[PDB]
Design a binder for these strands. Sequence first.
RNA 1: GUGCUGCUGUCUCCCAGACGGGAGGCAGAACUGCACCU
Length: 787
Amino acid sequence: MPSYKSSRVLVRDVPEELVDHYERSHRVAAFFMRLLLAMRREPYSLRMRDGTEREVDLDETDDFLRSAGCEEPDAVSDDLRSFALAVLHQDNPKKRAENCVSILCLEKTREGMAAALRLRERGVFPVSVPEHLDLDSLKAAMASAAERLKSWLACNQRAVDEKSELRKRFEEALDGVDPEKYALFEKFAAELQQAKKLVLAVSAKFKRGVEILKEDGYKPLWEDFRELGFVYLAERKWERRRGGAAVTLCDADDSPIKVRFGLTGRGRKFVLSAAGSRFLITVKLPCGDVGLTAVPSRYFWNPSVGRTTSNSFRIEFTKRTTENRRYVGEVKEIGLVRQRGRYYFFIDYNFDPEEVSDETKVGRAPLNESRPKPKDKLTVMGIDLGINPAFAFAVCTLGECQDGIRSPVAKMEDVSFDSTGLRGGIGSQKLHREMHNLSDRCFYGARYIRLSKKLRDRGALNDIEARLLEEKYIPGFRIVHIEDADERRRTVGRTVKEIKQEYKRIRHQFYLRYHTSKRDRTELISAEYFRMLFLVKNLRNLLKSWNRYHWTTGDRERRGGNPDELKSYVRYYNNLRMDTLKKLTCAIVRTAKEHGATLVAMENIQRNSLLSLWAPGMVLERVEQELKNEGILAWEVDPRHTSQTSCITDEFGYRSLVAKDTFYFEQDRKIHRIDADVNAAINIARRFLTRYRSLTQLWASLLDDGRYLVNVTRQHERAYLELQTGAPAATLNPTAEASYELVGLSPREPFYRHEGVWLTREKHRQVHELRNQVLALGNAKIPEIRT
RNA sequence: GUGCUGCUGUCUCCCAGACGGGAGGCAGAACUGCACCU
């Protein structure tokens, strides 16, 4: 329920009577993770600092459990597995039985705990802990290891789901059709792999890949290269996929974990005191205590601490920012992480968000559903998550209208989108451009290395290889091609060094942005962060390729267990990702608070873009959390044609593929232009405000009679017809002007609204005529409206 | 304090193989700017 924040403080001269504890905690955590990864004998792939993954066998698991202390782990495997599953959150919550250590390491109903009791009275349970430690430290280490195993089992279930989906998609392709001829097609593949884009290249039932099939060697079927080839592709995809989620062990110097402390008994207790602008930490080990001088931290400039009746340490501090800002909260746990030698005390705490009145929550549903209205003069703000703009914004006060873009709303008067603009644009006409250039250069070199590897090993293997060489990579790497291999290798090295130097140049110019006399005018966020994120993400691969060029193409294994390869760049990229996400968070909160932003709409990006740099959901989740922590109540919105339709005429439009930021629409038989980003911002606000009263896409199928039937997936679609047609379903009947309409029904091709004539996929793709018209009339002649 | 996030001199280990890269330790200066549970 409550939220969280956390920051680190550094203790410099640490006593050894705690460094030993750190080491033993790491040891016991690793052993516990292996014990719980073996209690279920399903094998898996693992790895170490090496990075290349060995594979276990069930015999290894048997011997491991034997070393634990069991004699016939296979014989009693049932209770062990049940206890393990009940421990690591594998099962559903009601079957859910750090809290296990009191049953595990002791010497003197849900199936997990009953199984543990059986395993003990059965004479099997008590395992031999490799190292001596106190019970609370065992609890903390089990907590860490179990959390990591929880992540692993979640990811393993995910991989299982992925492989199941691949298998089902392949099955729907084969569907048992002509299995013998399928084997014949596999025999054809035998030559193909020795002699999908090819399947698309076979467009007509008319180059050795496309010449051999005509010959009698594989003529005898010739049936159709849609059924023939899709099945092979799906089988190949199901063949090539990792089905399990690997594991990394926890290593003090390679895979560190946090050594946690807190008053709640999840580790040794603690006392936090402050004096002289710095924290002082005392931890009650079984051997006594220790005094550690947490170096003063700007996150805790002038702090203080205080005990509470809630068994928590209340603190208060001032965070260095553009101004002096105040914070408070309750501290309940601390964590020790030894990164590159220095001991850091992680500080954790809860803190209240700012107050919210239910007049916000009420406003914060489908048109087929009726619920009360705001009944309050709140302000709705637009957020358009993107790349070039961090968030295009527009805020229009409901219960008021002065001037601007007039946008209707569901069952209330018109609102006006007056305050508009962009946040997070390019901080330089040159820096972002150069940075994007370098990122693309990396993306292309990282493949030309493989291309030259194959060419050196075997020579030109086919035509499309040379076509790509001359078309995409050679210009993406801008190097001279040399027939010999030695000079080509040295040219690869030269270009690698040049990319290094350009990375240094960019990195140095980009660090000075926050120190030179221009400090004040440097924006909080900008597209520069995202573009240099892309640059690092692709430079990592370019180098990782340059580390593996000396060896041939057919290899598959590491030549030596050299750890910590390119980990500096990985750490840089990840720290940057965290910082940039925080900065976008801060920019959104700042641009939202001043305007009020009592309700915020942000497109559901989940349906060279945000999805690449982050997992699809983390951006939205953390943005909702941060905006929540401030008292604001954000909200997500479907983006489907929110970026191609118009916000003044409610009709589809053209988002210029070349003028990427501009959008075009026509009103009153006149052509008008607008900033596509602000446009979108509006349309998302419009959809939030109007309860999605104007659909623009429908998928309909046909079976007979020559007329299609609408589909029913999301309640909003079901409400659209009931509002426009009057029946819960309808059909796409024809009309003279090569278009459709909706005339209901009585007891899946594209279709798009336009004016209501519903020009389908082909005729919809009218939008090209709009493009031709708007291009022919000249952009400079077009009205540009408030932006 | 963690990062953004650095730089210049120097010191060492690994991969390569005369082009290059990877990983860390110190020591100087420049500047005190921007965010901060992964």
